[PDB]
Amino acid sequence: SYFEPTGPYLMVNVTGVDSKGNELLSPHYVEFPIKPGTTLTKEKIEYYVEWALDATAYKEFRVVELDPSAKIEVTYYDKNKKKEETKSFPITEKGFVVPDLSEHIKNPGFNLITKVVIEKK
Amino acid sequence: SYFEPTGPYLMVNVTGVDSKGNELLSPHYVEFPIKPGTTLTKEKIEYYVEWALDATAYKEFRVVELDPSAKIEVTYYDKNKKKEETKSFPITEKGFVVPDLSEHIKNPGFNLITKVVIEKK
């Protein structure tokens, strides 16, 4: 889309590095629409980062591992409290259900800013 | 300096916003040399962010508050473990003493990536 997204979305900002820590790919920005009620698990997230890398020179690379301390975070301004609120969700096999924040913001961006180790298959 | 810094440094990456959350200033990158043994406290850190804003249009603005969840973080590759290690330090009045990581890296960058609320004096 050319315009601001109309609903919740997953914003993937990933830095790709090799197994020795050398940066291969700079923070690459990609948006994916998501809907409240969806369960986001570790495998689904890895699939979104592979999808993200498809727009790069590293489209055929295997994603070895995501930084284990990586979390999905959403920040918004609560209008009724006049305060900024930030929620964080862990990336696990059980996963978490995407909440509906429409009461505060119609197009919340769920952020995944992390480093990923990649390698040739 | 035009070249890569030769010793430890504090890297300030701040986003300035007003009291309603409007972004006034985009992540602004500034480096300050620091030495192991120095105690970095909340007030010293606020002083570094004011110093950082002096390079911007918001040089006369008062820094109202730093995001309370902001931490100072340093990431490096431990050569003997062949693993990346990340250390985080809280921003408090007691503060923390800057460690000497020269065994692993000669010019570690202590990162402060946070949002700060600013206003006219």
UniProtKB/Swiss-Prot annotation, chains A, B:
One biological process term in Gene Ontology: symbiont-mediated suppression of host complement activation by activation of host proteases
Keywords, alphabetical: Pharmaceutical, Plasminogen activation, Secreted, Signal
Listed GO CC annotations: extracellular region
Compartments, as annotated in UniProt: Secreted
Main location: secreted
Family the entry assigns: Belongs to the staphylokinase family.
Record function comment: Potent plasminogen activator that converts plasminogen into plasmin. It forms a 1:1 complex with plasmin, which in turn activates other plasminogen molecules.
Protein name: Staphylokinase
Species in which this protein is naturally found: Staphylococcus phage S phi-C (Bacteriophage S phi-C)
Range within the parent protein: 43 to 163 of 163
